[PDB]
């Protein structure tokens, strides 16, 4: 809908200007599930929009049958690759073996693993054969994110964490971590908050962070103390930022409540970054907002990884996949423009 | 949206009419709270309850004059220390809590507090229900209720909110009390939620929520799965399922496409949460971001009608709460017919 | 002198029990046969008709030290050397049968039965003796260990040390002052019950308080534990006054009790104080002993199937006679209930 | 036994004259307690302190005339909410606990409690000390003191009792506050008790109590041994020994006969306990069946002089306690000019 | 050697079982239809009429590698590719039914069933084959998992790996050497029973030792666990000699047993060794294999409803043959239990 | 096989010849044991040590002269209670354990027990070594040794066995002492074993054993990987690898085929076990079913040479044990010239 339509549009244009400012180059983005119906319709929409050069994984023949089966003339010159047959396959196996030979994985096992398109996608982005990847529209979340974590890994002091946008009529809220960590520590919560914060900063918005709890500034043993400590750590790391907690969710989003009941709070003007204390709360919240709050909700997107990779959920729509790939492109460009410095 | 409240108001009238026209006596510890009083104006125009206010009679009349609402004069006003049943109440609280760290002086001082006094009023039949906690935090407001009124058999104190959608309403629990309920506690919460939904002539369809879809893995997935099983064994006629993600629960299309083995068909109308972080955070986020109205929380599992507001409540929230307290009070009066 | 009046009544009951049982005196074996102090005690008691003592050690060594402190009334006393007693191998055989699956081999067992403590124990267990008194030479844990291993507890019983505080008219009973680090609610109830039976033996109504640092709070930890212990004790003997959790001054002082906690079922001051942990019991009884004017006797071991007592390593000679007296009484009481 | 009390009283007079004849202001939240007023009768006639009574002015004047006590007709009596610094006091408390669950309404209503008000008065220098808790249980009374006045640096709040023997005096700690103190905490307590004993020109000799004589075994014995080692390393001039049984500690003859290696000769005069059950049971049993008079408990480790009585306290117990509260207030004021 | 005799006996007993069952051979499926070692094994196995092998993979790849390794006797052998088989979707539906509440949806079930291990498993489960051998190609946990998810355990049974140590005279059986990290007393008892029932099949008296670092100590930890395990085992099978806790030399050397522990119900030396945890069983069998002169066969999977074994990938061709032999033998046993 | 043992004997002869003809003094607490006396019979004709027997002098001559031997009347015999340095020994033991539950009488009684006496003989330089425990179980026998002689700096008591093959020898540890050694502790055991292996002129190659090959998974895999890393960081000159299975550790062909990245080439000759079950069961199983002779256990990590047998030992085992005990005694005596 409407708010979603303007948001994505600004993003599509920035990928246009970032490609137009690096010689017109498009980010190379690999899709392990080359035969997915949903993914292919999405790519159809995506290629006329000049955002990425897609790379598809699977048997060349089987996917060409399925794209023709799905009536799409705009998608025939795109690279299609079967991992075992790619020329860089064995260097990739040796690399994975090198990475996990002391983590229960032997050489044969590395070969078997690298044959799975997820691992191959990850190794492609990791070795620079692709700029980014989108995976997991058919497999469950944990299993899809695992190769990304083993192969691409996190940036220094970073923590893998899923992030969603709920798009309101002027502003947007960001929610994390919605997919990865069961029960993040105070330290992990602070880090999750900082990652969410940089994402908000990309969009030119001042980040205002709340560490969520079932309590309003109580600091009692358990989740309240944990979110209070998390805000204290985040603040020690970024003294320029409005970061506050522990607080209830309405206290966080509604500044009128804040200023009336807790005026001492350093969080003024309503939070636009919401950090959850555990996975039950984040997962349940973003999904409920999506289904009954009737507010537009995009994501989840993966934060904390060194190269751009995002895993879809199985319930994702086709335009949802387009959103995900757009942001994968933006992230890839962001990273490559940051590695030039 | 407005339809639901107005309907309930009609039911208060229909029940009161079927009982000789008396309205449920509802006590308010916060007698000088602005919100409680003007909301009370709006509800008192509607013949929903006979309000009893606690405080100094004179401070309450001064602040009644201050908010220019003549329509609630002549309503009963009581100062706890000066009520004739005061010493008897103190004696009661004492016998209840003398082996729980409380001496007679402590009992006296506690019964002077409007919350304890209200609680005891409801417990002794001096009132039918109470609405408190627009000024103090939930734990502190709910505590005298748990100590005085208590739970019914095998019951569990649990907060429940309604999400009122376009045709449907969803019920959410436990949104206020239990930090990390067990499987067993979750089943009980489900059962309580279910009875509430049944009151409204709707068949309960229950979801035990998790971050997972039917995995049964160690931790929350297994706990909510086991909860579903326990609920089914205590009441086999019910549509109760889990572990499942929230969208899987509320969206029948997702259910039908991705998990057709599920004994839950048609979208859930009861969502039981795995812990207080998720339940509290969710209902408050929905109330603030979704168009849908959220009423509550209402305290389930207690022997008499008692409800704690959230401190962040608007006045419409308070009139809504008082309405559903009234209904609850007459439902209870009707279950006490046995 | 409360100690002398108190012991004197006891001595009269051992005398009363010995009559009507053919005039027979309980046989009590003493593992430290070469100890100066034990012998000093035996001198005083053979003059008092309380038991027929059996001493363990080498006959030559024992007559040596009996000759050294000039005591003629204990010549003609039963003296036994463990390896040379005739039932020795039958004994080693039973200990072996008892502990073959609890780390003990036949040789190890052999050497253990050679230890005076284990043999004294096995003697009482096989009915070749009626009671024992041990550990005037060895440490407490180390002395009680063979007793628990050979003699054991009676049904539902729990090993527990008990002291008497003798005041100007009544006495207080304190337990458990020696054995259990951190008794559960259940165990505290059993401790209470055993103490109570002792008090009942003296014709006094037992009045039991489960001690805590709290007055009826039932809060998490020891308060809830002692409240629950009293509820258990009350369920097991509903005729008895048993109450808790409460503070010690609340416990012993009835005026304090009635002024502050009239709902309490304990009226008249406690005469049995059951403690929540070993620190409280041990420290209390020893302090009462050292700064309190009042005399404190014990500790005596309760809960065992046959009459056994462990002394302290620091114990005096009168400590040994009152200990042996109580041991005789215990042996007689048991033999008389085993009568139908 | 009363000899010790007289020595203390005379010192109160001596310090009082060395500061212009000025008396320590000590506030008593229980302004209407018969016990406190009778004890204050004895104290004002003894020139030990300037009393501050908390409550409604007229009700306590009513009860001082009602209980026939003419020597405190003119004493300062204060009702908290009507005090001129009431709102600034609410602001400091609010500021202190806004992130520990307390909102401004809760701050106001708390500051109304005489306990909280006594503590804030001493905190802000409006009074020099306070004695409370003859009517409420210990935890509830000591809490505002810990929240408002707090501990001094590296300090640990702990109750200390004096055993007055016919000869020496013994000190017992921690007799009221901490359930199961660690080695480090036991050491700290030993040092605080030690400084108290030094105040009286006495060499403190410290014993860490246990059920064991120098075993150091897993549990309480190791803890009391390690606590003695810690104490010895933190203050090498003091005789501090453990683990040991109590009779070993107080009887020097047993010490020389059985453990001549101990660095403690001459019998202990500072007894530090392994847990709250042992300290509480012990001092109370000694007080009730022991022939020695026991005073306290006194709270150590706090920045300003504040002491909580025991509920079982006698009136002579209160006069004793307040005498030593005065001495403490003076020591604290004389060290604060540095 | 010892291996050659034992294997010949197993083979002759497979032949003896094929009689009275119509000359029918156990149907055994090999998901790794293209494994060199397995095909090499299958030559030897089919000349010996041990099983009717079913190969999984592409018909053309497997016939190509059959031709490439010159084995003429495996042309016409059943070869099935999971995806093109007629009961494929029915198999997917069954797996979906088994794991829909354990995190697997219909699509995940489809993909899993596409894997030869899962398809093999489901064949055994559905009676379209009698047994399976996998994992000469993948590491152990991954290979054993589909078997447990599809085939499962029998009543009160436990997945457990078992090895034979073949000596110059006797054989010892070792378990559990592959699956369970730290089995309980109860689980150890079950493991012992499974090892025993196997020993019984060969007409041998099972004599079982619960191994520990201790001799009949029953102390906290693994000693108490192995003694308790032995007690549970005895209570379920009183005709059997089962003893513990004991040290290994005590267990296998009857002269030691009789000299130091005559009370022990284990006389004549153990031939079943049940280990307290996976470190000890796994390290034990590998050290025996590598430094003793003793031959070691296995591991074999016990506790499963139908006949399935996983090789280790480090397996030799003769190893695959042993595995298939004992798998066939097991299959026949199980079919003999379905005879009432 | 026999060659390794004869080589040890040949070296004890070489040091015994090269330091003036001195034979290492070795004490035996069980002076009346048949097994020990038969071993002593084989050993005294081999000039490896000066034996001292413990028990009643006349009783040990009763059983030794009586059963098959003419070469044992020339031997040292000691009854603890009658030895001239007895009371001095109890005095040092008292000093060592006075704060560990043992008082002077208990010190006397322990020192009358031959095990404590033997250890104290070695500790005071009055003897060079001891061999004990064919009559008592292992723990009870090793305790006086640990309480008296103790560990060297950063050392940890650990039993070590040799498996003797036709070319190599392997060491297995810790086979006797620690239930579930930590990563740090395992590294330490590795280091002590490596030191013994260097002594025999072989380069140590250490493998940390697991049920897994380089998985590093939660539990034992991670523990042994971590142990190998710590050990390498303390001794970078050593080949140390893990976590790995036993065939992977001992068989170098397996290593190069399956795990070519490993820093361990040539097969491990030092095997460190993850727990007491695996170590004890392993060495006993190899001992009973493999052709190979297994000697030990020998107690490592302790300051002076002391060793405990298991009863399951044969006489030839006692022969071997006393042999490396004498040799050990000579090595430690050579560190004592510094």
Author numbering:
A (entry chain D): 436 to 776
B (entry chain C), D (entry chain J), F (entry chain L): 439 to 776
C (entry chain I), E (entry chain K): 437 to 776
Please give sentences taken from the publication describing this entry.
Bacterial hybrid malic enzymes (MaeB grouping, multidomain) catalyse the transformation of malate to pyruvate, and are a major contributor to cellular reducing power and carbon flux. Distinct from other malic enzyme subtypes, the hybrid enzymes are regulated by acetyl-CoA, a molecular indicator of the metabolic state of the cell. The larger ME isoforms (hybrid enzymes) are predicted to be a fusion of two unrelated enzymes; a catalytic N-terminal ME subunit and a C-terminal phosphotransacetylase (PTA) domain. The PTA domain is homologous to PTA enzymes (that interconvert acetyl-CoA and phosphate to CoA and acetyl phosphate), yet they appear to lack critical catalytic residues and thus acts as a sensor instead.
To verify these findings without using mutation, we were inspired by flavoprotein methods used to remove tightly-bound FMN32, and used a moderate Br−/urea wash step to generate ligand-free MaeB. Washed samples of the native MaeBPTA PTA-only construct (hereafter referred to as PTAapo) were crystallised and diffracted to 2.72 Å resolution. PTAapo retains the same D3 symmetry as the acetyl CoA bound form, and, in agreement with our HPLC data, there was a clear lack of ligand electron density. Loss of ligand binding results in locally small changes; however, the use of d2 as a stator and d1 as a flexor means that these small alterations are magnified at the isologous d1:d1 interface. When superimposing the two states via d2, it is apparent that acetyl-CoA attracts the 3′ loop, pulling d1 and d2 closer together.
